[PDB]
Design a protein around this ligand. Sequence first.
Ligand SMILES: Nc1ncnc2c1ncn2[C@@H]1O[C@H](COP(=O)(O)OP(=O)(O)O)[C@@H](O)[C@H]1O
Ligand SMILES: Nc1ncnc2c1ncn2[C@@H]1O[C@H](COP(=O)(O)OP(=O)(O)O)[C@@H](O)[C@H]1O
Ligand SMILES: [Zn+2]
Ligand SMILES: [Zn+2]
Ligand SMILES: [Zn+2]
Lengths: 431, 242, 193, 601
Amino acid sequence: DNTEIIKSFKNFILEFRLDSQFIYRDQLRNNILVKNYSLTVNMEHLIGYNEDIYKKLSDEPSDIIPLFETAITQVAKRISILSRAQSANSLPTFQLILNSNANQIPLRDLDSEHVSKIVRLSGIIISTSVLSSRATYLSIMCRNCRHTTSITINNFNTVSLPRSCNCGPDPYIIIHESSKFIDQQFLKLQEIPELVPVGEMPRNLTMTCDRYLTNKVIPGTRVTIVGIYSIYNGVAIRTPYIKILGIQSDVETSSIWNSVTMFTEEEEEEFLQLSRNPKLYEILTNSIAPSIFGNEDIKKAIVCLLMGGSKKILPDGMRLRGDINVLLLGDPGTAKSQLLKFVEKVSPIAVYTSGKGSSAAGLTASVQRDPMTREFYLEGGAMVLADGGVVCIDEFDKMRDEDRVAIHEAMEQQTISIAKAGITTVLNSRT
Amino acid sequence: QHCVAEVLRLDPQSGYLKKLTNATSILYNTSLNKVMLKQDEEVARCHICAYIASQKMNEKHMPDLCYPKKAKHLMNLFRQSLSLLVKKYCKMTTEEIIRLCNDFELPREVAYKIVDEYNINASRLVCPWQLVCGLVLNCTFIVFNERRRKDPRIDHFIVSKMCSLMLTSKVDDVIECVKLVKELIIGEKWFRDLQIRYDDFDGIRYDEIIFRKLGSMLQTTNILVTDDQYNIWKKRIEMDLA
Amino acid sequence: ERVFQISFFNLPTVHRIRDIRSEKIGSLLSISGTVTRTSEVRPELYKASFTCDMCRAIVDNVEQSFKYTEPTFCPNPSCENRAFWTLNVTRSRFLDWQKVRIQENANEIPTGSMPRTLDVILRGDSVERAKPGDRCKFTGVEIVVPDVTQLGLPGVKPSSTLDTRGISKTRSLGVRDLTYKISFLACHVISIG
Amino acid sequence: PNVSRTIARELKSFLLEYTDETGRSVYGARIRTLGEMNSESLEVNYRHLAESKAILALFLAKCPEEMLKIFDLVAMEATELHYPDYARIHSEIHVRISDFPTIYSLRELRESNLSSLVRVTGVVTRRTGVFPQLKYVKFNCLKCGSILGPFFQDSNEEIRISFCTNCKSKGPFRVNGEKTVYRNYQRVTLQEAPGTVPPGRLPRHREVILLADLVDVSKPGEEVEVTGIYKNNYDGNLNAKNGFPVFATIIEANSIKRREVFSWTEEEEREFRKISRDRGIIDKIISSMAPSIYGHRDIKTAVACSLFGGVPKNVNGKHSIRGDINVLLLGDPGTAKSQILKYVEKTAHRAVFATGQGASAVGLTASVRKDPITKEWTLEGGALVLADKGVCLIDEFDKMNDQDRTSIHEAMEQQSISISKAGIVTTLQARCSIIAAANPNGGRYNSTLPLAQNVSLTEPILSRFDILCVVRDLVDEEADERLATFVVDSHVSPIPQELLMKYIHYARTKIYPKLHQMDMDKVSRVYADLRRESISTGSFPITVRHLESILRIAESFAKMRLSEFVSSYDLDRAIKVVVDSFVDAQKVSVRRQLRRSFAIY
Ligand SMILES: Nc1ncnc2c1ncn2[C@@H]1O[C@H](COP(=O)(O)OP(=O)(O)O)[C@@H](O)[C@H]1O
Ligand SMILES: Nc1ncnc2c1ncn2[C@@H]1O[C@H](COP(=O)(O)OP(=O)(O)O)[C@@H](O)[C@H]1O
Ligand SMILES: [Zn+2]
Ligand SMILES: [Zn+2]
Ligand SMILES: [Zn+2]
């Protein structure tokens, strides 16, 4: 039956515990306060607790998932009414989010078998196309009968409108002011370039997501994902893809200028201990380069540099550069390169480049147009990716004149400007 | 091989099976060998092949082998290439009442017993709907006592389903269709076997009803509730903090 | 179990591509030129069976050169619509095919002139005797084939249409546009030069 | 024909009691291995049953697409008899053939041979997709919320149904892609071998379809022998056929091969260790490195240090040290410069032979490149990227523009690439070993000037090269006496390179030899000595770069010997390599250094 399974699943919600503490119960209680209508789940926790759901969810995931959705909705209704009775109408289904670490399978080793099952894999991300919408609950009226009805779609964001509620075929108009919709996006993926055959190009695959599993990723961020090998439409052929059911990403891949700004409280005590120690300067000078010798004078400047300086804005707009500017000058050896190599590790959000700009890395704003619609969009730049951060350079001698002009103006005002044919820009460097 | 066996063992829905699968294989082989037998959707190319396979080996049974336009065409082409109770004096067949009994998903032995009852005692009838309806209802009540006991909602749902299937709004007539058949069919040995099998005996167990009627007070009228009920109910309030 | 081919070689006269007009239609005529391309061997429809769309009646006849669309006669004429038909692949006969592109030769060109070219087709066992980038002496008949590339050109354009005079009460006109190029066929070719 | 009874019984008798030598029932092993490995295919050698009876092949030729029928079900019967419930798991079984003698080119196909057994030759190129297509169908009806039963699909048409079990209604039908079952279907291009196209003629091409779960068993640049059937393709829209009514052709291939996965076995690492720990393998390694040319041993040894790679480390995740080794050769073009690097490509693991403009695999960078198939954006990277663990070859280093030089600069500098184009920002692992070449200005090296003055290269990427070897004209008579004799003989102790590459595969994974600080202050002693002795008589200095590179070479030789840790009397070899590499890289003024710096020999 299905109710035996739904009960064996609902028991896992409130009757599971580890480390002598409830996990999913209070997680749901916190989520309802957050107004999240979703959760997180680990499928490793379900193998030991119960084996009546794993071996059947493996092969019939689409058949078993909506049952779990409805069970979560039931738990939510109970806890909602009880919480309203405790302190202080519309509760739609909750998306289920899960992950795993059992294994990873590459795109190369796939086949036409284990289709519609659940799989694991790795890759790299490219596409962020558009927030294409789907419907979840939309109302209908018949144009002649004026007969109101309703429809709701659940998971496939199978059936079509009713063909007959004389009015004839196609008697229904679609309302929008009283309808409901969700978002999804078409995401791509391609294997690791380092694990490929020598000759051929790589192969990619498409996927889709839903309400709270969207917008989580930006290209370049290596991710491992788990989904279902589903199908839609030679002699007779249907396209393969994957439907997302669980996504895990690195906490923070290539530096994000929108980084964390609210630190924890436990660190503050030792932060202030180090602040009040009179040996702070000596500790920093000793530790900024543990495997390096001499040049204490040079190492005593990096500490001044990293902490920036006095940001001062006057009522005329003529700001003073909050940070400082430095220039090594030396012969081979003398660690003139090793410090620069190391500085990126320590720096929270900063970039490193060589002269003339590195491979496909404009030393400044190298703007171009869109592959789609042929429109203008600022692309990037070594002097703006690290906004609010330090920049490391080597081989400063061999610069192009145009490349050097912009960086030379940045070294004194830290605000590049480009005014080509159509686009006019004032993009802040602050580095 | 999978689909061939799927269709061949669909006939029920010793040597028969083996010889039939061999016959179907070789017949399909002969039909597809030459370029003379084309434009034939495999959607239905294992039906009259099975019919003629039955015809060939030793014995042939006309009924339920053809069970349509192109059926005869393919046969020739291959064989050349080689309310409901007011109505008075209604009629019935095997499969009509088999369908009416199979809408509940009841077993086949009960349906066959009802069919035997009909074909033995359908000579002095006024409306066979009444007798068949009563028979199937009193089969449902006897076989489904467990789920009815654990869920008193079923009673209304089943009665509504069998009131809508016969297109009526009044139900006392259905009540009569039940009690009259109970009166009529009350003393047959196969009915006895069904009674001992599914242990209804008016919806109550034998070992309880004997003491209920013998004149004792130890008879277990279960106004109280079983211990396991309380044991499993405790869990509901165990988690009341949420 | 019998299909034949023929050829006529050692003709006395030679005609360049510019020396071909509209009075040599269906007439044997020797030409010489050059090759710049070949094509893919693709078995061609010599004979092909059909079947009635309401029975197994097979017809092993073929309409071969063109008008390859529809036979009519059915062995059992009792049919609601005997006009159209079905098809079959196995009860059939096939023979080789090949396409090349023929080209002007340098030693016979006029002034202010490009190497005017056209397409010629082969048949039968004589195929495999073509060759890219060589001068050859073809011999065959003035086959012609439909085309539409010649649209947008001046003058009036011929058009076919079935008659509706003498019989009445029976695009409804079924008008088909006709405008043809002058390709060539080859019964036999030799490598000159 | 209805001879299927006799045909089936006789072919099953063959399958069962086949015996060729010593009463060997070969196919029993095939079937039992099939059951053990859960395989979907089995092979049958055409030669033996053809020898036994040939009308088998006659009836196969008349209709092989029909002859398959008894064979697949007989395979199923045999599989079930020895493996119950195999029918439950594997729905159907396909078969394979081998040893067919008839030979057809890709242009020899004639109409008289179609619809019969066909055996061709060619090369697989332009592989595309492993797409799925249906083999069992069930539906989702609208008039009734029910399904359809299972139904096998033909090889040449779609499927569509208008009736229903409940009634004769032609309701809207849709396939339940969420429940059906699929199989493997591929489209593959196939072209003739250019090595035998007769004079003048061009090579024709065809198309091929690969099924039976054998997809992705080929890669471009392979010689293949596909044996199967041949037929036409009625792909609809055929009433618009101008000219003559002629149709295309397509092959359905059964058997596939690749002739016309390196790994180490227990005895193979046993012998590896046995020979590594016995008496200085290095001399024999240099002897067997590349017999392409007799040449000379110094750059062979430099590249030998380049092959194995060192050992990277970090001081608690900071102050990283490069493990891999670099090289840079240079000299007059009259000698062999672009030979041994291609030999290394052929011999190493995950190596690449890239180049600059013209006859190059990739442009030595990463870019948002288009794909011919359905416009597929991809992020390809230079040969450096592919060999993040391995090595990347280059020749004609001088012939680059600004960006394709800054790329290699970034590689050797920070072992990571960066991209800031097309709405995508990323870095990778570029910890590759680099090999390169170049052409001196004027052919001869101009012995009377230093390196940077002589060749117009720049210093910042020139520094990374631990080794900068150079040669010039070898004018003596013995040079002729050896080289001319060897070259003419080309048309008149060393260990197999297979064992060498399996050795390097074995070495890069296990051994990470250490080095104990026993007498290691001699490093500081000799470094200070020579760092003063450089100013004593020379112009340019020697920097701690060479010290670190000598340490890398020491660990590389430790890996080479496969010893547990560094050996004292191999730091001598490393020091000598770096010394005599610096000797030739200076003016004639270094002639004093020849005598002075020979003590450390
Ligand atoms: N002052 C120093 N202290 C410690 N190690 C150094 C120092 N200078 C150079 N090295 C070592 O020498 C190598 C070259 O470093 P560096 O001088 O920064 O680059 P370059 O030699 O190209 O200028 C590095 O591997 C580094 O470990
Ligand atoms: N010692 C040698 N033995 C055999 N062949 C040699 C030898 N030296 C040079 N060659 C031949 O001369 C050619 C030299 O080409 P090379 O100078 O490497 O071209 P590039 O400078 O453009 O790379 C090689 O292809 C090789 O076949
Ligand atoms: Zn209506
Ligand atoms: Zn007819
Ligand atoms: Zn229906």
